[PDB]
Structure formats: C-alpha cells, structure tokens
C-alpha cells in the first residue's frame, strides 16, 4: 500500500513528463529517464506518511516557443474533485498568470466540476485526467500511429493543395484518448503517419470535432 503507491506516482510522473515533452514543453532528459530509485530519492517514499504528498508532485513547465506559455500539473489529494478545489487551482493560476493546467484525479471529478472546467474555457484551459489513464503512455502502444498537430499555416496549405473544405476531412473526436493526450481542441487538424503494407507509408489527416 506504500511501495505500490510510490510506484504508481512514479509512473504517473513519467507519463506526464512524456506528455509535456510531446506537447512541446521544455523537459530535461533526466526527468524523462528518472528511475524509480531517483523518484524515491528526490521525493519521499511513504505517501501514507505524507512523504511525498500529492501536493509535493506539482510540476510547472514552459513552452519551447515562448516562456510565457506555461502549464501546471496538479495532483489533488482528494479522490473526488469538486468545484472548490477547482476554484483554488484557478485562483493560483490567475495569481501566477498561468493559463494552462492538467489535473490528475484518482477516482474522478464531480459533474459540476467538469462543467466549471468547460465554463472558464477561453480564459483558462485546464484539463482532467484519471491517473489510471496516465499509468501508461498510450502513444507508445504498437496500435497507435504517430500523431502530429498541424499549424494553421499547414492546414491552409493542405486544404489548398487538395481543394477541400474542412468538413471533408476525416474526423477525430476531442475526447479521443490521443486527442486528449495532445490537448488539441475543436477545429485543429492532426496529421497521422503510419506504415502501409502496400505503399510503405501513408499520411492521413483528421479534423478535431
């Protein structure tokens, strides 16, 4: 109940570091390859005894393009997250001027908390994750091809080259596991690169809807 929880926290942290790196944020190669022993060293080893506390695991990263773009990853201690803790996190994000945040919950999040997350969307973009979903990195599964987020200029070039309207592309849901992993919203286009047994390689595009 303690070694297992420590292993779980280490796995969640590793997956979150991989996710942050994949989204373009700055992460050092040592954080990505941090061993379980290094986790027990830097952080505690008795989560039951409060070492480490989930509040000790919060991370803050900055984008590679502009340091002004920053993201929190919070680990609420309470297995079910309600509006109050969301308001707390929003308050500190506002205080520090951070517009993005990931919230890793244990059991889930109350329906009203989800409604709050979506309500303050345009100002603050904060996303929810079950820790069970973060115990592995789904982008490393053999069934998951490489997904790449396209820039607006790239999307314009694509639609011009193939003379398509957006609604003619294949679709991906915003609630898709990979879409949530990359944090892409409605109207963005993800480029998918997969091997093919006939051509060798094949690029397809999906619009987020």
């Amino acid at each position: 109940d303690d070694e297992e929880e420590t292993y779980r926290l280490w796995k969640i942290r590793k997956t979150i570091m991989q996710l942050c790196h994949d989204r373009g944020y700055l992460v050092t190669q040592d954080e990505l390859d941090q061993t379980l022993e290094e986790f027990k060293a830097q952080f505690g080893d008795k989560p039951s005894e409060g070492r480490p506390r989930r509040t000790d695991l919060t991370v803050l990263v900055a984008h590679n393009d502009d340091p002004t773009d920053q993201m929190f990853v919070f680990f609420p201690e309470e297995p079910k997250v309600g509006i109050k803790t969301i308001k707390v996190y929003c308050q500190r994000m506002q205080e520090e001027n951070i517009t993005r945040a990931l919230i890793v919950v244990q059991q889930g999040m109350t329906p009203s908390a989800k409604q709050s997350l979506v309500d303050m969307a345009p100002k603050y973009i904060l996303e929810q994750f079950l820790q069970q979903e973060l115990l592995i990195n789904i982008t490393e599964h053999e069934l998951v091809p490489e997904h790449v987020v396209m820039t607006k200029e790239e999307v314009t070039e694509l639609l011009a080259r193939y003379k398509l309207r957006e609604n003619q592309l294949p679709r991906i849901q915003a609630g898709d596991p990979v879409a949530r992993y990359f944090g892409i919203k409605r109207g963005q286009v993800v480029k998918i690169i997969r091997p093919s047994e006939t051509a060798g390689r094949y690029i397809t595009y999906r619009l987020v809807q």
């Binding site: 700055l26 919060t58 900055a62």
Partner: peptide, 29 residues
C-alpha cells in the same frame, strides 16, 4: 559538428534548470 549539438543540449539543459529554480519558488508560492 556532433560536439556542437552536444553543447546546445547543455545550453537547453541550463535554460530549463535556470527557470526551474525561479519556478520552484512559484510552486512554493
């Protein structure tokens, strides 16, 4: 040339470590 890119990694390693300490007070604060 490969050594040059080795230097850049440390620069980015520094560029992140430098701001982690500044951030660290922020997560504390």
């Amino acid at each position: 040339e490969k050594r040059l890119r080795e230097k850049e990694e440390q620069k980015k390693l520094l560029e992140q470590r430098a701001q982690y300490v500044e951030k660290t007070k922020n997560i504390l604060m």
